[PDB]
Amino acid sequence: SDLTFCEIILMEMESHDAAWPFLEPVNPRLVSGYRRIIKNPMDFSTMRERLLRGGYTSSEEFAADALLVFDNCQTFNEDDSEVGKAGHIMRRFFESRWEEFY
């Protein structure tokens, strides 16, 4: 039942308007300084790979990766950058949906 909501909310974040910065890993060959500043990158496809393969034990583990996406987003991107402003839309969305199941 737990991982059924994670399926719903990852589906909902994967198809969200604001999801475009987070759908695929950051390419550090293209984003100068990313490799150095972000110790543990995370993106929605890696969570999808991990969920489909079954690599989540609970909803907490799933939610940690989701929050690491947005924690990384705020570390690397200015709150008013385009990725930044998208990041806040996604984080608020995730925070909300998560709380209206738990």
Ligand X SMILES: O=S(=O)(N[C@H]1CCNC1)c1cccc2cnccc12
Chain residues in the site for ligand X (CB under 6 A): 21, 24-27, 31, 73, 76-77, 83
The answer to whether 6 touches 62, Cβ cutoff 8 Å, is yes
Cβ–Cβ < 8 Å for 10, 48: yes
Of 9 and 38, nearer to ligand X (C-beta) is 38
**C-alpha–C-alpha distance, residues 79 and 81, integer Å:** 6
For residue 65, which amino acid is it? D
Quote the least distance from Cβ 37 to ligand X, whole Å.
Answer: 10
State the burial class of residue 19 (Cβ atoms within 10 Å of its Cβ: 0-12, 13-18, 19+).
Answer: middle
**In terms of CB distance, is 63 or 68 closer to ligand X?**
68
Using the minimum distance from each CB to ligand X, give the nearer residue, 83 or 89: 83
Please report how close the Cβ of residue 21 comes to ligand X at its closest, in angstroms.
Answer: 3
Task: Tell me the two tokens of residue 21.
Answer: 């910065």
Provide the minimum distance between the beta carbon of 83 and ligand X in the complex, in angstroms, as a whole number: 5
- Smallest distance from the beta carbon of 73 to ligand X, in angstroms? 6
**Cβ-contact 72, 41 below 8 angstroms:** yes
CB-wise, 36 or 100, nearer to ligand X?
36
